[PDB]
Every structure is written in structure tokens, then in C-alpha cells.
């Protein structure tokens, strides 16, 4: 939950200024943990960017999140290193310095260090031709 | 003051109570026109009319005077 959230925010204004009609927001992240893809879905209810939920591995809860100063606008290979705070409903609170990149999201805190690989989705986007090419060539 | 049709009713303000904010002092109905007056004159308001009493045009329904 903290790792997935950092990649969005530490890349753009996802969940920032977002707005729809008579509905609610939704945004998802795919993690390639081990050899099995992992999907995490985040959404909001109310007029609150603050109130956020999560559903990973059929486990649901709520938390709030308060970020820090925005840094590393150039978002280079080092990308963005920012501290995060997360208040989960149960009652806890956490602080996480996340240096996130397209390749992976690294979270360091009292849990330890964990890097989660993001599900790779690249394959000659364009040149994807399965045509037989039987005759009348060159 | 209310227009000609009158028929004041449902007055929700106590006589001799300060009115600085513009609450609905009296509500008069003219062809389903509640048209609340909503006076903002400061000071207590003194009522000279009663609910259900048909009043003439531009009648002195109440005197909104400074609290003395």
C-alpha cells in the first residue's frame, strides 16, 4: 500500500485535483512480485484526498496519508526521494522515505527495506505483426 | 410593511428580542408569495400584529427600533 502509493505521487499529481461526476476515483498499480503479477487498487470516497483505501490479496482497509515537500522535479534515474506518513485506521502511523522509479519502488522504514518490482509491460509496442506474409513480397 | 393582500401568519420572532442578523421577522403571503421581508435593522423588534390577521397595504406590522 505504501509502496504503490509512493510511485504515483512520486511521479505525478495522481489523486491530486482529481474529480469525476456522481462517481468516485480509481487508480491501480501492477507489481511483479516474484514470478506472479500483483495488482493493487486505490480509490477514494467523499470529497477527501486524505481518506484512502486499498485492496490487495483480497484484504481491505482504510488509511490516511500525509506527504512531505515535493522534490526532484527533474525525475531522473535517481527520481524522487521523499518522506511519507501513513495513518491507517486501526491506529498506527508510519514514516517512509520512498525513492521510486519506473523499474521499482523502494520503501525504507521500521519494517526494514523492501524493493518491489513493477510488472514490466514492454514488447516492441508498435512493430507487433503476426501477418503470415505468404506471397507477393518485395 | 407588507403588500396589500396581507394575511400574516407563522411569525417566528419573539417581541422585544434583538435582531442584528437578517432573520425572517414576518412572513406574509400574497398569492402563495411568502416573500419573506428579512429585515437587517439592528435592535429589538416590537410586534403590533398577530398571526392570521389580514393587514392593509404598507401597514406598520412592527417597529424595528434601536434597543433602548
Amino acid at each position: 500500500a505504501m509502496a504503490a502509493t509512493a510511485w504515483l505521487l512520486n511521479r505525478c499529481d495522481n489523486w491530486r485535483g482529481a474529480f469525476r461526476l456522481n462517481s468516485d476515483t480509481n487508480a491501480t498499480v501492477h507489481f511483479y512480485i516474484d514470478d506472479h503479477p500483483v495488482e493493487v487498487r486505490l480509490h477514494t470516497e467523499g470529497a477527501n484526498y486524505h481518506k484512502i483505501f486499498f485492496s490487495v490479496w483480497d484484504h481491505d482497509g482504510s488509511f490516511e496519508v500525509c506527504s512531505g515537500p515535493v522534490t526532484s522535479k527533474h525525475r531522473d534515474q535517481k527520481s524522487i526521494v521523499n518522506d511519507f506518513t501513513f495513518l491507517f485506521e486501526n491506529g498506527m502511523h508510519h514514516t517512509v522515505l520512498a525513492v521510486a522509479t519506473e523499474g521499482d519502488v523502494t520503501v525504507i522504514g521500521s519494517f526494514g527495506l523492501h524493493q518491489l518490482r513493477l510488472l514490466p509491460l514492454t514488447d516492441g509496442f508498435g512493430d507487433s505483426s503476426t501477418a503470415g506474409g505468404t506471397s507477393t513480397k518485395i | 410593511v407588507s403588500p396589500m393582500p396581507g394575511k400574516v401568519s407563522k411569525l417566528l420572532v419573539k417581541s422585544g428580542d434583538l435582531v442584528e442578523k437578517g432573520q425572517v421577522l414576518v412572513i406574509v403571503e400574497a398569492m402563495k408569495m411568502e416573500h419573506p421581508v428579512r429585515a437587517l435593522q439592528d435592535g429589538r423588534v416590537s410586534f403590533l400584529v398577530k398571526e392570521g390577521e389580514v393587514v392593509g397595504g404598507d401597514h406598520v406590522l412592527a417597529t424595528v427600533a434601536e434597543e433602548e
Partner: protein, 566 residues
């Protein structure tokens, strides 16, 4: 007298008279109103969900929406068959197309809600949307109009509500100089209501007219051909600065595959008849040939990029701004709204609403002691100065004069206007008629129509009759319209028309009770059978429908939409 400041302090303090301090007390009256509002929004906010993923609602608990039960299995089967083809059956193309973290509007929604009555008496045509979805989208730093043709072809491609939606989108884009993107999937035409949709004016030809008038003004437009566009639908790929044809299922035809039969019926493959022909054919038709949906969407984005509008939008609308919230909680907007179905008009207020919507909860009153009926003054909406006309009571001549004066100033200084509609409220007194009230009403309407200022209106409630001509109306070119649930648009009288038309209709003096049962009850049924939910939006009368709580965000979308204008 012992008072010598320098205007500020008196200003720039948390105590300026400019602000407003209407604090509610949450009493029964508040509850009665607040509760009802809640009773007026839940389904509004809900039907939206049902038409979204239309006809497939797995919860099966949609009793909060009065929508009839529909065959969910048939719609799921159709969607499965369509998605097996390789194309995404949803609005998914849109949120894939728009940049993440950005906004959206969904201009017209619930379009064609239970519009047509079928041969089956209890069945209506299942047009969950108008057949398309329309909303303002920000692509690659560029604001654009997005029109997507839904894959619902069961009833037929386009209806009198579909072409009207498309033409409204085109007119909005041309007025605002937002480039359009069309997502094209069609079943051809509708050969049943063809007289209603093909000939005459404001029809399918005007789409072709607009796609050329735009390119005259150098407002580039883009179309994506996901499926077949026949029966005059093949001209949009031809009339396009950039067009995209998917490698397998993208097809464009001027004559149908059945049409070659019975007229030199040497039938050949549908590919050779005009579909995506990636073999270096002689035809130079269609700019982009993309192997996959993602590839096509990506090339659309890439073409949108090379338009040079990013600099102009970034300069005109500041991307990095500090949001200033109002002083009072926006959830309280439902409370000040009174209830419904009340014999006599209930009471109402405006100050609270404006204090809840505007920035910093402030206002700039003009003459309020004089013409106490009508309200006009300046404001602030998310960093932009605004003028608001909100109506309260029965209009007088002096109210019309004040309105004309305000509109004069606003046009003079180029300030946008916002309208909050209310009752007609034209007095019928003989002295008022003798006082030249008609001349003053004309004074108001002349200024309203003559104004070159961008104009948006939103229904508060009770907009019935010719009074809207005084403030604003669809026939007065409002660049956007939005509506609240408790809206009634009717004849010059909502309640009085009942009383007046009771007298003058072939009524005997006797049988009074049976007559009032047949007259008054019937006309009440007629004049409140129309409402916000059905007569509006579904017929693209005041196309936008919103919630009262989230009005300021919507109006801020509208104002940012109307500053790319020339």
C-alpha cells in the same frame, strides 16, 4: 472620530464585511430540508453508475434507482463477445487517453434516459447513454473535447439524441477552440427513424459541415476509426487532419458488403471492400495504421502532442496555483435548499449558497436595499473574478434595471457571468403594467442577449415560465448548462396555471369536485411530470446534470474551458 486606519486592517483581516457569516443551527427545519436533499441526490449519484457499465450491475440491489430490471445476462454476453474481438468495450479508451492525475467533466450524462417507448408497453429502448460519451479532456498538456461512440448498436447507431449530442459537442469545441477527438464505432445508420435523423437541418450533414468549418479556422481535429463507419460515416475519416485505422477490426465503407450483392454481386473479402488494408494499396487513406488498441491510442496522443497548444494553455491557465477553500463546509449546501411538493412556495435564501460556493466566502454587493428581489455582485472562483446573478422573489422593474446595469459593467470590463435560475416572478398588478414594466423587461433581455461575455447557467430550482428570458436561457447561447435535482421547467405558471386553466375550460358550474379532480389534479400531474431527471438532459435540454454540493468545481472547469477562446 477616534478612527484612523488605512483601509486595510479594515481590510486584509479575518474581519472584513466582504465575507458572509450565515451559520446554520441544524434544526428540524434544517433536517427536513437537509434530509430531503439527501433524498434527492442518492439516485442521481446512482443511475450514473448503472448506465456506466450499462445493463450489467452485479449487485442486483439497484432498488435505489427506479430503473426496471433488465436482462443482465444478455448485456454481459454482448460485452464478452465484443471484448473477445480485441477491442475494449467501455469508456476505457477515454481514461487511457487522458493524462493521469488530471480532471474530466463528462459534459452530457444519462443521455437518452428512458426516452423512446417501444411496441412493448412496459418496455423502453435501452439507451443507457446517448450512444456516445462526451467530456472535456486534458491530453498531453492540451485541453480537448472527447467524443466516443459507444458500441451499443442493438437499437441502431445514431438517434435524434445522438446527433444532437455530437453537434452540441462540435459547437462547444468551435466556440472554445478546443480540438476534438472522436472515437468512431458505428453500426451504420438507423433505417427506421431515418426521416427524423437524415434529412432536414441540424442533422447528420451538419456534422460534416462543422468538421470543415473547424479546419477553416485552423482548429485541428482528430478521429479514431475503431470499427465500421458506413452510410456517410466514412467521411469523418476522410475529413480529418489525422485518422487512425486499427489493423484488423478498423473498417471504412461507402457501400456495405451486402450492397455489392444484387448489383454486380462478385463478393470478395471485407478487407478488400474498404477495411484496414495494410498491403501498401494505392489509396492514401488513413494516416495511422496501428497493430493494437494501445498502439492506436498512443499514436493519437503523439499526434495531439505536435500542435503547439501546450505553451498557450500553460500561459493562459496557470498550472501551479494555491487552492483557496470557502469558509463554510460545502456539505451544508443541501440544507438551505427547501423541500419539495409543498402546496405553497416554501422560503428560500441565496446569501448562504454564495457564501458556501465562492472563495473565502465573500461577496461584492451592488445596490441591495433597492430592488431587494434580485441579487448581483462580483466574487472569486478559484483565482478568477466572476459575476453572479441569483434570483430571489418576484421581479420588479427596478430589479430589471439593476440587472441591466450589472451586465453593462461586466461586459465593459470583460468579467464572466454565472446564472442561478429561479421563479418567473413577474407581477401582474395594473399599476406595475402602467409603469412600463414591459419596457424594463425588454431593457434587461436586450442586455442579456447582446453581451459577448461567456455565460453559464445552473438551475437552483423552480425555473418555470418566461422569467428565464430576463436572466438567461438555452436560447440565449450559454456555453454550458448544468442542473440540480430539484428543478422544474414549465409554462409561465407552475401552480397558478392550474388555477387559471381551471376557470376557462368547458366546465359546468356544478360537479365542482369531479371537475377539480379532472382539471387541477391533471394539470398538476402534467406540470410536475416534467422534472430535472427526465425532461432535461435526456433530451439535451440543459445537458449537464450535477450535484448541489460540488458546484464550484464544475463552474471552475467551465471557466478554464472558456479562456482558450479568441
Amino acid at each position: 472620530y477616534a478612527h484612523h486606519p488605512i483601509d486595510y486592517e479594515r481590510s486584509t483581516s479575518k474581519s472584513p464585511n466582504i465575507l458572509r457569516l450565515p451559520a446554520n443551527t441544524s434544526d428540524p427545519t434544517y433536517q427536513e430540508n437537509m434530509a430531503r436533499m439527501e433524498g434527492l441526490v442518492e439516485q442521481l449519484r446512482a443511475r450514473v453508475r448503472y448506465v456506466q457499465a450499462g445493463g450489467v450491475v452485479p449487485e442486483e440491489e439497484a432498488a435505489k434507482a427506479g430503473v426496471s430490471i433488465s436482462s443482465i445476462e444478455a448485456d454481459d454476453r454482448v460485452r464478452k463477445l465484443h471484448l473477445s474481438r480485441g477491442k475494449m468495450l467501455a469508456r476505457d479508451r477515454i481514461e487511457r487517453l487522458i493524462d493521469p492525475g488530471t480532471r474530466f467533466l463528462e459534459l452530457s450524462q444519462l443521455a437518452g434516459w428512458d426516452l423512446y417507448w417501444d411496441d412493448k408497453k412496459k418496455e423502453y429502448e435501452r439507451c443507457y447513454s446517448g450512444g456516445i460519451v462526451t467530456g472535456i479532456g486534458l491530453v498531453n498538456g492540451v485541453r480537448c473535447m472527447l467524443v466516443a461512440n459507444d458500441a451499443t448498436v442493438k437499437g441502431g447507431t445514431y438517434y435524434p439524441i445522438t446527433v444532437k449530442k455530437h453537434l452540441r459537442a462540435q459547437k462547444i469545441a468551435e466556440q472554445n477552440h478546443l480540438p476534438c477527438i472522436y472515437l468512431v464505432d458505428s453500426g451504420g445508420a438507423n433505417l427506421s427513424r431515418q426521416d427524423d435523423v437524415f434529412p432536414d437541418e441540424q442533422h447528420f450533414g451538419r456534422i460534416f459541415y462543422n468538421e470543415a468549418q473547424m479546419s477553416i479556422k485552423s482548429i485541428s481535429q482528430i478521429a479514431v476509426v475503431m470499427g465500421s463507419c458506413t452510410a456517410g460515416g466514412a467521411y469523418v475519416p476522410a475529413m480529418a487532419d489525422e485518422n487512425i485505422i486499427v489493423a484488423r477490426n478498423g473498417t471504412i465503407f461507402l457501400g456495405g458488403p451486402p450492397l455489392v450483392l444484387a448489383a454486380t454481386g462478385e463478393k470478395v473479402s471485407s478487407e478488400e471492400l474498404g477495411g484496414a488494408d495494410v498491403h501498401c494499396r494505392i489509396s492514401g487513406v488513413g494516416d495511422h495504421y496501428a497493430t493494437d488498441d494501445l498502439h492506436a491510442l498512443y499514436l493519437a496522443r503523439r499526434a495531439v502532442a505536435n500542435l503547439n497548444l501546450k505553451e498557450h494553455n500553460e500561459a493562459r491557465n496557470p498550472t501551479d496555483v494555491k487552492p483557496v477553500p470557502p469558509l463554510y463546509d460545502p456539505r451544508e449546501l443541501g440544507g438551505f435548499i427547501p423541500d419539495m411538493l409543498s402546496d405553497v412556495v416554501k422560503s428560500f435564501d441565496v446569501r448562504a449558497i454564495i457564501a458556501r460556493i465562492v472563495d473565502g466566502s465573500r461577496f461584492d454587493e451592488f445596490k441591495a436595499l433597492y430592488g431587494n428581489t434580485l441579487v448581483c455582485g462580483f466574487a472569486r472562483i478559484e483565482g478568477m473574478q466572476v459575476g453572479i446573478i441569483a434570483n430571489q422573489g418576484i421581479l420588479y422593474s427596478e430589479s430589471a434595471l439593476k440587472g441591466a446595469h450589472f451586465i453593462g459593467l461586466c461586459t465593459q470590463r470583460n468579467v464572466p457571468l454565472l446564472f442561478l435560475q429561479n421563479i418567473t416572478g413577474f407581477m401582474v398588478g395594473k399599476k406595475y403594467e402602467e409603469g412600463g414594466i414591459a419596457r424594463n423587461g425588454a431593457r434587461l433581455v436586450m442586455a442579456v442577449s447582446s453581451a459577448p461575455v461567456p455565460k453559464v447557467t445552473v438551475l437552483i430550482g423552480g425555473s418555470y415560465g418566461a422569467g428565464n428570458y430576463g436572466m438567461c436561457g438555452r436560447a440565449f447561447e450559454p456555453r454550458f448548462l448544468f442542473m440540480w435535482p430539484n428543478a422544474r421547467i414549465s409554462v409561465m405558471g407552475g401552480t397558478q396555471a392550474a388555477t387559471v386553466l381551471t376557470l376557462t375550460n368547458r366546465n359546468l358550474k356544478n360537479a365542482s369536485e369531479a371537475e377539480i379532480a379532472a382539471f387541477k389534479d391533471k394539470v398538476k400531474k402534467k406540470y410536475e411530470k416534467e422534472g430535472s431527471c427526465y425532461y432535461s438532459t435526456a433530451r439535451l435540454w440543459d445537458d449537464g446534470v450535477i450535484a448541489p454540493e460540488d458546484t464550484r468545481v464544475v463552474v471552475a472547469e467551465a471557466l478554464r474551458a472558456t479562456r482558450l477562446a479568441p
